Design a protein around this nucleic acid. Sequence first.
DNA 1: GGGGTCCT
DNA 2: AGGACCC
Length: 378
Amino acid sequence: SRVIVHVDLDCFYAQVEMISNPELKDKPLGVQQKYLVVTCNYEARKLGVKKLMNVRDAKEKCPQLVLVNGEDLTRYREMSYKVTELLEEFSPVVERLGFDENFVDLTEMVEKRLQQLQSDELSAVTVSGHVYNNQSINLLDVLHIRLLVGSQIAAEMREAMYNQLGLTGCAGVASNKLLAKLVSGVFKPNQQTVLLPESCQHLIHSLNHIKEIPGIGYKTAKCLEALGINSVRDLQTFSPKILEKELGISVAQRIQKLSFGEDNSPVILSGPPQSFSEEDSFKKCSSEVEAKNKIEELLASLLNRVCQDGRKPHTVRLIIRRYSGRESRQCPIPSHVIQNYDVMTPMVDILMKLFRNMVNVKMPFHLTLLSVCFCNLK
DNA sequence: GGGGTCCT
DNA sequence: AGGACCC
Ligand SMILES: Nc1nc2c(ncn2[C@H]2C[C@H](O)[C@@H](COP(=O)(O)OP(=O)(O)OP(=O)(O)O)O2)c(=O)[nH]1
Ligand SMILES: [Mg+2]
Ligand SMILES: [Mg+2]
């Protein structure tokens, strides 16, 4: 019996922005990347605006829409780490998922609390927030009692986040990662809900597309949808034999457990990042002098990031995207080069070679993306 | 779109 | 090196 919590910040980028220029707190807001509105405050979803939505569809639906550019993730990333560091303080094992989601395993903490309690105040243990599906609490159910303590820690987290960081968000408490994440969004925004075990089927059957299961993306969905498997219950019910023989004993076995609300995966300690990368897409790049400048630019920011980081990377990757999947070359970063200096020149030289490897400087080319990644950190 | 993770 | 997943 684990007690896991999923923390999900409301319209993160927008939130971070609204904290910056408070003048936009009352005004519906979109955060913009090229031609997309990636996220908007609630004041604006109110008006049909949806996450990842065209600026033409955006502006029209709401010509009162305000916009900030969010291509530079710097400030979001920093707040992201302030959030998880904050959660790491409740309990050290925190798993990040993107910039705006965290899992924390609350089991050891829940136990610690209960022991400190006596029969009286156990009376007495109440929920913080919503109980999924208005299910009834049985105070004599040890599992019920533990999930409620969880809800109490969740609430303390949510309050700490707001009081210390001004951030708002949802939490979902449950017995594994799948359910915690599934339940955290039942009441939005800035609310939390807890999942009692006897409501687990209800929760998973509440989904409408098998892709709404975390663990099941485009490819798998499509492959499933071609086997006639469309509902959670189809997947639950479909032939284990056939499914294995179809997506591999690996995928098949686990995504079938997922369909029953079953998820054994541990909450892993994310710790410091295992890669830094910058990218920029564009209409077209067809010269190698543009590239170098672009790449000098990506390489620029990366340098300050790792510089400010305190560890050193031992390999670089260059990623590109061609005219109308991606491609990449990597190589170790040399000994002395891992180090008040002119790291640019040698670095860009490496990237350039790697660059030419993929690109034909003599045969015209059309690139729609450049990216530099520093991995293999020590 | 601008990022990340792990597996193969 | 590429693939799939996540946000
Ligand atoms: N899922 C997804 N998120 C992206 C993408 N590009 C940027 N993001 C960032 C922008 C948003 O701030 C964030 C969306 O994550 P969430 O699903 O948790 O929603 P968000 O926190 O933005 O607001 P919400 O309360 O969920 O409406 O992810 C993308 O391509 N897919
Ligand atoms: Mg959210
Ligand atoms: Mg999914």
